[PDB]
Amino acid sequence: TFFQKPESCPSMKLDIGIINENQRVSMSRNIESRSTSPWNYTVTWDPNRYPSEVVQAQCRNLGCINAQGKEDISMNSVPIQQETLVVRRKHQGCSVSFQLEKVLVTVGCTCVTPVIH
Amino acid sequence: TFFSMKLDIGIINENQRVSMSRNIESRSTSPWNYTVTWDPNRYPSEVVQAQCRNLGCINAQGKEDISMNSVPIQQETLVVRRKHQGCSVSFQLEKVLVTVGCTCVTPVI
């Protein structure tokens, strides 16, 4: 429905620019490290993709970190994921096309109280 | 630097979904609740914004612990906006900050 158009019309059109560029997350509060469920990031780069960089987090621990700095396995670090779209530039010539692509991004981890089946 | 232009049919890995039926929003020590916005001219139509339910984190006993803070986790996401109607319809990328949930951080001086 979203990508269709009534057939009466004689390869859709992507317009240049991104709505609401002037917008950024606050990155540098060192939450990744100070979290009771801390996480690393891995930033893999693809030249035929926009954005080129996809930023994926991995939970550093199975448990959560207590106030003494020790791993508490009575709970789990579970990763939180968000859907985003990227654009792939296909072909190599005057006839260049663009295609949308869904990526699951692990944004970071939280600490969950485990429950019994 | 990278790029109207031809947009190919179909979305690569559309079928991938986030498992959101494991009640992590509740069982988290930094639990969060949800606000959702539906827009038919936006793909995906749903955007789901989380907000921390506590200032502190919940301990094993279920009491609020304010020695630590619940802090939201935001992601820079792209969504497509559908523009115009009839046979002159076009698509443009839009940036949306999505607060995906909350984690529990020991504070600093």
Partner: antibody, heavy 123, light 109 residues
Framework: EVQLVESGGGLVQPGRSLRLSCAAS????????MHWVRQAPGKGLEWVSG????????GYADSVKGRFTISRDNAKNSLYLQMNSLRAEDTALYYC????????????????WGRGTLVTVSS | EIVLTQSPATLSLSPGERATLSCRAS??????LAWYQQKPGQAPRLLIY???NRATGIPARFSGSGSGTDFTLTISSLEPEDFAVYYC??????????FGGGTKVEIKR
């Protein structure tokens, strides 16, 4: 040069509404959680309300919930406390207090205080 | 709620002496307790945070101790400047930043 100045204090009648203000100056204001702590004449300290850098973390004391509304403005390096349905029990010196937490988060310990603004609730 | 009970209310000792102030919590606040000094016509000044850590600028004659429910501020070499009301504050559990009754220190002379 690193100080908090509050204002909007004075006489208000039971039921009517008042708004305290606090001009922060000489530090990065959006790097800190901010508090209102009050002191009834010849009495001890009472934490009223707190707000983190983002304004996503709002807290209120039971004595005050439903009636008072904290807010801030990182643009104007300023903090406000909308008080409504004011009672006699609210008569107090209201200090603008600055949290000692880094990254705009709550440590719930106060390093910088203002001179105070007196609020009398009387007919 | 958590209740902080300070004792004694009043206390009077001569310069060069050691004053021993007590804060008692209704339930454990672990190591999450602070000490403030309020001199007359002045806002409180943080002396100690998290039980035993002296704040920036605080002399070494001001030192704190305690754990769980039972805490102690100690001013060991009393000066005449040290006339004030001394408060304990908890950052362990909800509701946050609850304060003690206070303890007034009269510098005997």
């Amino acid at each position: 040069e690193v100080q908090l100045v509050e204002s909007g204090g004075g006489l208000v009648q039971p039921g009517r509404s008042l708004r305290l203000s606090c001009a922060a100056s000489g530090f990065t204001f959006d790097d800190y959680a901010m508090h209102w702590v009050r002191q009834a004449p010849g009495k001890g300290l009472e934490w009223v309300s707190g707000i983190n850098w983002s304004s996503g973390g709002i807290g209120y004391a039971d004595s005050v919930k439903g009636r008072f509304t904290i807010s801030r403005d990182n643009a104007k390096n300023s903090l406000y406390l909308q008080m409504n349905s004011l009672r006699a029990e609210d008569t107090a010196l209201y200090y603008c207090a600055r949290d000692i937490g880094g990254f705009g988060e709550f440590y719930w310990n106060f390093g910088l205080w203002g001179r105070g603004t007196l609020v009398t609730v009387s007919s | 709620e958590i209740v902080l009970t300070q004792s004694p209310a009043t206390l009077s000792l001569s310069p060069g002496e050691r004053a021993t102030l007590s804060c008692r919590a209704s339930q454990s606040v672990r190591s999450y307790l602070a000490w403030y000094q309020q001199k007359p016509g002045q806002a409180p000044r943080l002396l100690i945070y998290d039980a035993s850590n002296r704040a920036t600028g605080i002399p070494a004659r001001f030192s704190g101790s305690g754990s769980g429910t039972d805490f102690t501020l100690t001013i060991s070499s009393l000066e005449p400047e040290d006339f004030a009301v001394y408060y304990c504050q908890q950052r362990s559990n909800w509701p946050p930043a609850t304060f003690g009754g206070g303890t007034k220190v009269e510098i005997k002379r």
